[PDB]
Amino acid sequence: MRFETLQLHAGYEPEPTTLSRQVPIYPTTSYVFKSPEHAANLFALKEFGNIYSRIMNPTVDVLEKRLAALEGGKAALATASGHAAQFLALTTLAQAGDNIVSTPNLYGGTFNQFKVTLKRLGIEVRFTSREERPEEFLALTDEKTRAWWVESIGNPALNIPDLEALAQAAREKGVALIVDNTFGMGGYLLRPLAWGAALVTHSLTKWVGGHGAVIAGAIVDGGNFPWEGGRYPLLTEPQPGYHGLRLTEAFGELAFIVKARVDGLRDQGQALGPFEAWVVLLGMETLSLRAERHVENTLHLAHWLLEQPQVAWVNYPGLPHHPHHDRAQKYFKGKPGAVLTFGLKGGYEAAKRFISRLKLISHLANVGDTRTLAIHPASTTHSQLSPEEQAQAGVSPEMVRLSVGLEHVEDLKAELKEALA
């Protein structure tokens, strides 16, 4: 009752000068200053929402306010990519010396970001077991623990975390729980903030954008996590970039999203650009319609793939006899995303053959386009790893990953049948 209307209207009222119905693109680097006073105010953070700059573009501003509305959150901040949003978030609450605790069931790229990049910058990422229990989160946390990280639907095995208990635990302890909600389609399938996460992160490049046209990421702040504790000196310190201003004092419950902007984004410069933000808004306008058709296509193909003689198994979490099926229902109302996995009975060789017979389905490594995508990681993504380190990563040699698009399901059935022969 309302997502459908937010995704068309939240964050933008027709611009007063032109009364344009569509959001304008402001391919600008700069904004003339209304007066020296307004200009003094901008640099002092005294007129926050109202003066535009190299770090708040008005086209990007619509995207942000809209995303916050779609996630049930209070404010959002866009960046040049999902990776840059994860990095800017973590780097806003943590500095060299700190650590964070993460599920290890991570998107290939976020694993490496944790293990190599953050490590090098003196931010220790400690990993839970693959079952990512709240106990193990708690067990790994100490005075310098700065966040816990988990994904709405985890990387290789498509597990759903134990989100309610995780959130209660993190809050109980006073750690910011951050959920990478990319697989929750912008809050449509799931809003982690509603279940008590502190912060959400997205690769908008995937289903929010939707059309495989732009790379983009975002952080969404619920505005309800106490930064005051003593766990977040970075948020409470007087701020050297702003002449000793205290962000928790000037901005209260929004101090995080404000800091990520005026400090992290200001210094590191992962600007999302305005055309790109504009192209995201376009895909956001149909987010719920694509979401629904995605998830229906995915269920249908999950069932169908099992009835197939050449298929050993299928891993979608919305299948009835799945490990985490109760969780699919609790969190995603029965609709846990649009990525499934399946093993071929003819193994690695047959998986390779299947990819080579694809015609309509595209052979590539992304997820979340309108078009249906397939990859055989064992021969591709992870082909640099030995089979033993592969199996180590949860990558089984006969597994194909399907990111199910919006084509007619009968056309997809015909294609899969052909490719599987």
Ligand X SMILES: *Cc1c(COP(=O)(O)O)cnc(C)c1O
- Rounded distance between C-alpha atoms, residue 30 and residue 233, angstroms: 33
Q: Is residue 217 near ligand X by the rule CB under 6 A?
A: yes
Q: Please, which residue, 167 or 281, has the CB nearer to its own copies?
A: 281
Q: Is residue 49 near its own copies by the rule CB under 8 A?
A: no
Interface with ligand X (CB under 6 A), residue from 88, 101, 193, 215? 215
Q: Is residue 288 near ligand X by the rule CB under 6 A?
A: no
Q: Please, which residue, 132 or 239, has the CB nearer to ligand X?
A: 132
- Token reading at 322: 């799945």
Q: Please, which residue, 52 or 348, has the CB nearer to its own copies?
A: 52
Give SS3 for 362.
strand
Question: End-to-end alpha-carbon separation of the chain, Å?
Answer: 44
Work out how close the CB of 26 gets to its own copies at its nearest, in angstroms, rounded to a whole number. Answer: 5
- What's the DSSP call for residue 188? T
- Rounded distance between C-alpha atoms, residue 256 and residue 269, angstroms: 17
Binding residues for its own copies restricted to 7-36, rule: CB under 8 A = 14-22, 24-34
Residue 334: name the closest of 342, 344, 324, 343 by CA. Answer: 324
Q: Is residue 107 near ligand X by the rule CB under 6 A?
A: yes
Residue 312: name the closest of 338, 340, 347 by CA. Answer: 347
> The tokens 């009968």 sit on which residue?
410
Query: Where does this chain touch ligand X (CB under 6 A) — which range of 35-43, 62-70, 201-209, 375-383?
Result: 201-209
Q: Please choose which of ligand X, its own copies, none residue 107 contacts, taking the beta carbon within 5 to 8 angstroms, the exact cut-off set by kind.
A: ligand X
- Rounded distance between C-alpha atoms, residue 103 and residue 158, angstroms: 13
> The tokens 């193909």 sit on which residue?
301
Segment holding 375, helix H or strand E: strand 373-375
Q: Please choose which of its own copies, ligand X, none residue 110 contacts, taking the beta carbon within 5 to 8 angstroms, the exact cut-off set by kind.
A: ligand X
Binding residues for its own copies restricted to 229-258, rule: CB under 8 A = none
Q: Please choose which of ligand X, its own copies, none residue 109 contacts, taking the beta carbon within 5 to 8 angstroms, the exact cut-off set by kind.
A: ligand X
Per CB under 8 A, residues contacting its own copies are: 14-22, 24-34, 52, 58, 278
